[PDB]
Design an enzyme around this catalytic site. Structure first.
Site, PDB file in Angstrom:
ATOM      1  CG  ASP A 112      -1.606  -1.295   1.481  1.00 31.34           C
ATOM      2  OD1 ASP A 112      -2.507  -1.634   0.683  1.00 31.34           O
ATOM      3  OD2 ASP A 112      -1.269  -1.989   2.463  1.00 31.34           O
ATOM      4  CB  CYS A 146       2.928  -4.050 -15.383  1.00 32.50           C
ATOM      5  SG  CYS A 146       4.029  -3.128 -16.511  1.00 32.50           S
ATOM      6  CB  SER A 147      -0.253  -0.329 -15.256  1.00 30.38           C
ATOM      7  OG  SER A 147      -1.260   0.624 -15.563  1.00 30.38           O
ATOM      8  CB  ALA A 148       2.769   1.627 -18.722  1.00 26.58           C
ATOM      9  N   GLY A 149       2.972  -1.640 -19.187  1.00 28.61           N
ATOM     10  CA  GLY A 149       3.647  -2.708 -19.898  1.00 28.61           C
ATOM     11  C   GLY A 149       5.085  -2.381 -20.257  1.00 28.61           C
ATOM     12  N   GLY A 201       7.566  -0.942 -17.268  1.00 28.37           N
ATOM     13  CA  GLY A 201       8.424  -0.947 -16.088  1.00 28.37           C
ATOM     14  C   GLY A 201       8.635  -2.330 -15.506  1.00 28.37           C
ATOM     15  NE  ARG A 202       4.632  -2.619 -10.515  1.00 27.60           N
ATOM     16  CZ  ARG A 202       3.480  -2.454  -9.867  1.00 27.60           C
ATOM     17  NH1 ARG A 202       2.399  -3.135 -10.228  1.00 27.60           N
ATOM     18  NH2 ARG A 202       3.414  -1.616  -8.846  1.00 27.60           N
ATOM     19  CD  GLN A 219       7.937   3.971 -16.694  1.00 28.13           C
ATOM     20  OE1 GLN A 219       7.426   4.930 -17.277  1.00 28.13           O
ATOM     21  NE2 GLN A 219       7.218   2.957 -16.215  1.00 28.13           N
TER      22      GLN A 219
END
Ligand SMILES: O=C(O)c1ccccc1SCc1ccc(Cl)c(Cl)c1
EC number: 3.1.3.48
Length: 289
Positions: free
Chosen positions: A191, A223-226, A228-229, A267
């Protein structure tokens, strides 16, 4: 900038950490600069017709490496924000892509079908710290339909840090023809701040990677943007392969390479450091189990 013998690597990590991670910062700034003298086109990502298909306006899919959807009886029905990415000694070992939008769910599953993808690696929660990161592109239970693709949840195992869902997908316009697709979903996201220990991630990379089937399409990683992770997973997995094969490591070289295939892969400097921690855990984990 040659491969580092695996037995010198942890010592190398000490050096990169020293003096408040000065070495890591040098490495990563070099990564971020390694594109300065490169113009890489992303015309399709920027086309007015495809804008709504990009989760983030600044996160694009390079033309040369972009995954192309088979066109539909619309000139731009071929587009999805996704790029092939090399793995260790293997071209196009991955598709790195954004967390799909409701509006791109059909594209998403069409790609998985067309590319013969058998594994999905999801490296985000749908919501994190109150913020929307990804829309749920799979059925909570039983079946859901996305275009000609019908996805059926067969079974789930919820581990401490990640969840494995086994789907069977069916293409209605084929005969239907059915495939197993397994989703590895890393679920443990603080969190506050960022993940702190590499070992559970290492275990997740190992299991999701070993699930890859010969001879199948590229593993889908998002991931979200695809970037960084997603980039972080790809480097860790690939370097574990290199270690296995040649007992050497080349994080900086490999990362500069895949940076030409999708923008911003790995990122942040902290992700860059995290890659090293995971590999360290793998190296130290051996010979002492
Ligand atoms: O989440 C981040 O951006 C972040 C920031 C700093 C350090 C690490 C991270 S992400 C760490 C991570 C978690 C799960 C997986 Cl599967 C992978 Cl491949 C990497």
């Amino acid at each position: 900038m040659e491969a580092i013998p695996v037995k010198q690597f942890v010592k190398h990590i000490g050096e990169l950490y020293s003096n408040n991670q000065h070495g890591f910062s040098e490495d990563f700034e070099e990564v971020q600069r390694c594109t300065a003298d490169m113009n890489i086109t992303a015309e399709h990502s920027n086309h007015p017709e495809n804008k709504h298909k990009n989760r983030y306006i600044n996160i694009l899919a390079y033309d040369h490496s972009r995954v192309k959807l088979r066109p539909l009886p619309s000139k731009h029905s071929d587009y999805i924000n996704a790029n092939y990415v090399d793995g260790y000694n293997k071209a196009k070992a991955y598709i790195a892509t954004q967390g799909p939008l409701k509006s791109t769910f059909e594209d998403f599953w069409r790609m998985i079908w067309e590319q013969n993808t058998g594994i999905i690696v999801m490296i985000t929660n749908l919501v994190e710290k109150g913020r929307r990161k990804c829309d749920q592109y799979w059925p909570t239970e039983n079946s859901e339909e996305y275009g000609n693709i019908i996805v059926t949840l067969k079974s789930t195992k919820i581990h401490a840090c990640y969840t494995v869902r086994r789907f069977s997908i069916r293409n209605t316009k084929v005969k239907q023809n059915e495939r197993v697709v397994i989703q590895y979903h890393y679920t443990q996201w603080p969190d506050m701040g960022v993940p702190e220990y590499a070992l559970p991630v290492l275990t997740f990379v190992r299991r999701s990677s070993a699930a890859r089937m010969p001879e199948t399409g590229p593993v889908l990683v998002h991931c979200s943007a695809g970037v960084g992770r997603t980039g972080t997973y790809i480097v860790i997995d690939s370097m574990l392969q290199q270690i296995k094969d040649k007992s050497t490591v080349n994080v900086l070289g490999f990362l500069k390479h895949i940076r030409t295939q999708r923008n911003y892969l790995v990122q942040t400097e902290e992700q860059y450091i995290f890659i090293h921690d995971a590999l360290l855990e793998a190296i130290l984990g051996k010979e002492t189990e």
